[PDB]
Write an enzyme that holds these catalytic residues in place. Sequence first.
Site, PDB file in Angstrom:
ATOM      1  N   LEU A  77       0.819  -1.273   0.000  1.00  0.00           N
ATOM      2  CA  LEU A  77       0.000   0.000   0.000  1.00  0.00           C
ATOM      3  C   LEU A  77       0.822   1.278   0.000  1.00  0.00           C
ATOM      4  O   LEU A  77       0.437   2.280  -0.664  1.00  0.00           O
ATOM      5  CB  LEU A  77      -0.920  -0.080   1.241  1.00  0.00           C
ATOM      6  CG  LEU A  77      -1.980  -1.166   1.223  1.00  0.00           C
ATOM      7  CD1 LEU A  77      -2.659  -1.255   2.573  1.00  0.00           C
ATOM      8  CD2 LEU A  77      -3.001  -0.937   0.079  1.00  0.00           C
ATOM      9  N   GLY A  78       1.929   1.286   0.713  1.00  0.00           N
ATOM     10  CA  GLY A  78       2.950   2.303   0.604  1.00  0.00           C
ATOM     11  C   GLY A  78       4.287   1.821   1.153  1.00  0.00           C
ATOM     12  O   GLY A  78       4.336   0.778   1.796  1.00  0.00           O
TER      13      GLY A  78
ATOM     14  N   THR B 213       7.115   0.544   5.587  1.00  0.00           N
ATOM     15  CA  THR B 213       6.380  -0.096   4.529  1.00  0.00           C
ATOM     16  C   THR B 213       4.999  -0.613   5.086  1.00  0.00           C
ATOM     17  O   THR B 213       4.895  -1.078   6.245  1.00  0.00           O
ATOM     18  CB  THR B 213       7.262  -1.182   3.830  1.00  0.00           C
ATOM     19  OG1 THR B 213       7.224  -2.373   4.592  1.00  0.00           O
ATOM     20  CG2 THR B 213       8.704  -0.727   3.723  1.00  0.00           C
ATOM     21  N   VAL B 214       3.929  -0.463   4.291  1.00  0.00           N
ATOM     22  CA  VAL B 214       2.593  -0.909   4.681  1.00  0.00           C
ATOM     23  C   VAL B 214       2.066  -1.957   3.671  1.00  0.00           C
ATOM     24  O   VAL B 214       2.118  -1.721   2.485  1.00  0.00           O
ATOM     25  CB  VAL B 214       1.608   0.278   4.739  1.00  0.00           C
ATOM     26  CG1 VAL B 214       0.213  -0.139   5.229  1.00  0.00           C
ATOM     27  CG2 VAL B 214       2.145   1.379   5.691  1.00  0.00           C
TER      28      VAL B 214
ATOM     29  N   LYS C 250       1.654  -2.221   9.231  1.00  0.00           N
ATOM     30  CA  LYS C 250       2.797  -1.335   9.174  1.00  0.00           C
ATOM     31  C   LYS C 250       4.029  -2.014   9.703  1.00  0.00           C
ATOM     32  O   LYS C 250       4.021  -2.467  10.842  1.00  0.00           O
ATOM     33  CB  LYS C 250       2.530   0.000   9.916  1.00  0.00           C
ATOM     34  CG  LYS C 250       3.740   0.982   9.843  1.00  0.00           C
ATOM     35  CD  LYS C 250       3.494   2.279  10.624  1.00  0.00           C
ATOM     36  CE  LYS C 250       4.680   3.206  10.454  1.00  0.00           C
ATOM     37  NZ  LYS C 250       4.402   4.536  11.033  1.00  0.00           N
TER      38      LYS C 250
ATOM     39  N   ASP D 228      -1.301  14.610  17.354  1.00  0.00           N
ATOM     40  CA  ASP D 228      -0.916  14.730  15.911  1.00  0.00           C
ATOM     41  C   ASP D 228      -2.136  14.651  15.022  1.00  0.00           C
ATOM     42  O   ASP D 228      -2.176  13.925  14.022  1.00  0.00           O
ATOM     43  CB  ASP D 228       0.143  13.638  15.521  1.00  0.00           C
ATOM     44  CG  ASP D 228       0.886  13.929  14.238  1.00  0.00           C
ATOM     45  OD1 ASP D 228       0.914  15.087  13.750  1.00  0.00           O
ATOM     46  OD2 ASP D 228       1.525  12.955  13.707  1.00  0.00           O
TER      47      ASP D 228
END
EC number: 2.7.11.1
Length: 261
Positions: free
Chosen positions: A12-13, A14-15, A31, A124
């Site tokens: 997905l993106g 490390t994911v 994740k 955040d």
Amino acid sequence: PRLDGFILTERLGTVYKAYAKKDTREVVAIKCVAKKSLNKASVENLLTEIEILKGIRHPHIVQLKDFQWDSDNIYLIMEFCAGGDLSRFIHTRRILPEKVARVFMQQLASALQFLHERNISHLDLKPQNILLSSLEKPHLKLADFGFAQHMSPWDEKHVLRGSPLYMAPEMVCQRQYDARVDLWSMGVILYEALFGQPPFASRSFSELEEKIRSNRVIELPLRPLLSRDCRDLLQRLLERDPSRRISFQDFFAHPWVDLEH
Ligand SMILES: COc1cc(Nc2c(C#N)cnc3cc(OCCCN4CCN(C)CC4)c(OC)cc23)c(Cl)cc1Cl
Ligand SMILES: COc1cc(Nc2c(C#N)cnc3cc(OCCCN4CCN(C)CC4)c(OC)cc23)c(Cl)cc1Cl
């Protein structure tokens, strides 16, 4: 030990996207962080994050489904959110109509009330940390508890926490802060949904810093036109002095939000 119980399917993106071996309709996002990458501090902060997340369950917070590790890595196994993030949702529309922003802020307020009543500050809040259950008529969920802290009204903190375009100005200006910083950040999210970018958007970091340290009151753009109750809320969230900022209780009860009804 090892990563057990899940079949990885996609980056997905490390994911990674994955499904549970025991229930293949249960989809998760994993994740993966290298232990090499983390400070002593960072190991200690990750442990407080996991302890915070294990104790909570809410329709507007991304659920920690599991936490695992092996020799080299840690794995945070999270509820999958198929709609992406609020940052993209806003940017692909440029701006959200007031009516849409209102439904969104009411969902975010429900999550903030749940955390506040348990003396938890996220620290955040921003659109990249707000995930969507689907692309249309989404349910918004809070993500990334990496900076979250136990904080009652007594507690005063000093270490900087959050993201430059979202951080309450007292963190930089006074070098001490309390739980009311999160109401600033909520003000920034609402302003970004309605006008397209944070109120301090800038060409350089030095320009952003000047805006953070200014004493000038925030001027809401006059277009688009917003309801008087919308402007009133915006202006009171974006007060620079935390002692003058709208209270948690007054935010939850504001007629534009109205969390009880
Ligand atoms: C912010 O912080 C964190 C973020 C994450 N990350 C995710 C969580 C969580 N939580 C849940 N669900 C996720 C779903 C994702 O993609 C969904 C598909 C989007 N579409 C793909 C197809 N294209 C064409 C349009 C967009 C995803 O993608 C990058 C990341 C996810 C984690 Cl695991 C940890 C922390 Cl700390
Ligand atoms: C700790 O918290 C925060 C700190 C910052 N502040 C900065 C960030 C960040 N982040 C990054 N980069 C910065 C660069 C800066 O200056 C670069 C220009 C140097 N000079 C030019 C003129 N010549 C003669 C001398 C050298 C800068 O200057 C004031 C502040 C910066 C912000 Cl903006 C937000 C938060 Cl929350």
